[PDB]
Design a protein around this motif. Sequence first.
Motif, PDB file in Angstrom:
ATOM      1  N   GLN B  18      71.363  29.504  45.094  1.00  0.00           N
ATOM      2  CA  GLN B  18      72.283  30.234  45.938  1.00  0.00           C
ATOM      3  C   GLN B  18      72.969  31.378  45.195  1.00  0.00           C
ATOM      4  O   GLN B  18      73.321  32.397  45.797  1.00  0.00           O
ATOM      5  CB  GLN B  18      73.336  29.278  46.496  1.00  0.00           C
ATOM      6  N   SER B  22      72.368  36.828  48.489  1.00  0.00           N
ATOM      7  CA  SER B  22      73.498  37.489  49.111  1.00  0.00           C
ATOM      8  C   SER B  22      73.677  37.118  50.596  1.00  0.00           C
ATOM      9  O   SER B  22      74.796  36.972  51.080  1.00  0.00           O
ATOM     10  CB  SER B  22      73.330  38.996  48.986  1.00  0.00           C
ATOM     11  N   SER B  23      72.566  36.972  51.311  1.00  0.00           N
ATOM     12  CA  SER B  23      72.610  36.637  52.734  1.00  0.00           C
ATOM     13  C   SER B  23      71.199  36.316  53.201  1.00  0.00           C
ATOM     14  O   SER B  23      70.269  36.276  52.391  1.00  0.00           O
ATOM     15  CB  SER B  23      73.169  37.815  53.536  1.00  0.00           C
ATOM     16  N   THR B  40      68.223  38.912  48.099  1.00  0.00           N
ATOM     17  CA  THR B  40      68.784  38.570  46.790  1.00  0.00           C
ATOM     18  C   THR B  40      69.893  39.555  46.443  1.00  0.00           C
ATOM     19  O   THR B  40      69.992  40.633  47.044  1.00  0.00           O
ATOM     20  CB  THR B  40      67.735  38.648  45.662  1.00  0.00           C
ATOM     21  N   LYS B  41      70.730  39.181  45.480  1.00  0.00           N
ATOM     22  CA  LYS B  41      71.824  40.043  45.035  1.00  0.00           C
ATOM     23  C   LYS B  41      71.258  41.393  44.601  1.00  0.00           C
ATOM     24  O   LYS B  41      71.838  42.438  44.881  1.00  0.00           O
ATOM     25  CB  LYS B  41      72.556  39.412  43.851  1.00  0.00           C
ATOM     26  N   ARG B  42      70.121  41.364  43.913  1.00  0.00           N
ATOM     27  CA  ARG B  42      69.486  42.587  43.441  1.00  0.00           C
ATOM     28  C   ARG B  42      68.833  43.365  44.580  1.00  0.00           C
ATOM     29  O   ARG B  42      68.110  44.330  44.347  1.00  0.00           O
ATOM     30  CB  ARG B  42      68.452  42.265  42.359  1.00  0.00           C
ATOM     31  N   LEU B  62      75.263  30.649  53.101  1.00  0.00           N
ATOM     32  CA  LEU B  62      75.236  32.113  53.146  1.00  0.00           C
ATOM     33  C   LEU B  62      75.533  32.772  54.492  1.00  0.00           C
ATOM     34  O   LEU B  62      75.314  32.195  55.563  1.00  0.00           O
ATOM     35  CB  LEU B  62      73.875  32.612  52.676  1.00  0.00           C
ATOM     36  N   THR B  65      72.673  38.331  57.011  1.00  0.00           N
ATOM     37  CA  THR B  65      72.639  39.710  56.528  1.00  0.00           C
ATOM     38  C   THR B  65      73.132  40.635  57.625  1.00  0.00           C
ATOM     39  O   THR B  65      72.756  40.477  58.785  1.00  0.00           O
ATOM     40  CB  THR B  65      71.238  40.161  56.188  1.00  0.00           C
TER      41      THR B  65
END
Lengths: 68, 67
Positions: B18, B22-23, B40-42, B62, B65
Motif C-alpha cells: 500500500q 496512491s489510488s 503508484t506514487k511514481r 485507498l 483515483t
Amino acid sequence: SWHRPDKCCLGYQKRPLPQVLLSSWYPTSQLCSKPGVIFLTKRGRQVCADKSKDWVKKLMQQLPVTAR
Amino acid sequence: WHRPDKCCLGYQKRPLPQVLLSSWYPTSQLCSKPGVIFLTKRGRQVCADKSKDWVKKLMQQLPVTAR
C-alpha cells in the motif's frame, strides 16, 4: 510493476471516417473483448473501429501503422 | 466518436505494498476481465484482479483515483 492496462474497443465508430483526417492506426490486443483497430486522427484523437467492415479494411491498407 | 477504453488483460500476481500506491480506478464492466487499476506514487498504472482479497483490501484503504 509494469503490467499496464491495455487499450480495448468497447464500442465502434459507425459512420465511415474520411482518410484525409487520419494519420495512422494500430490493432488492439487479441485478448480484448471484441476485435478492433484504433485510428489516430491528425488532431491526435483515438477512434475505435470494427476490423470486419470493408471501409475499415480499406483504411488499414491505405494508412500506415503507428510507430508505437 | 468512440474512444478506446482501458481494460486489464493481465493481472499483478504478487500483492502490492500500500505504501507504493496512491489510488485506484475501476475498469468498464464491458471489459473481458473484471479488474481495477492502481496508480503508484511514481505515477505508474498497474492492473489487478478485483477478485483477490489483497486487491479488495487496497480498494478500501485507498481513495479512488481522481481521473
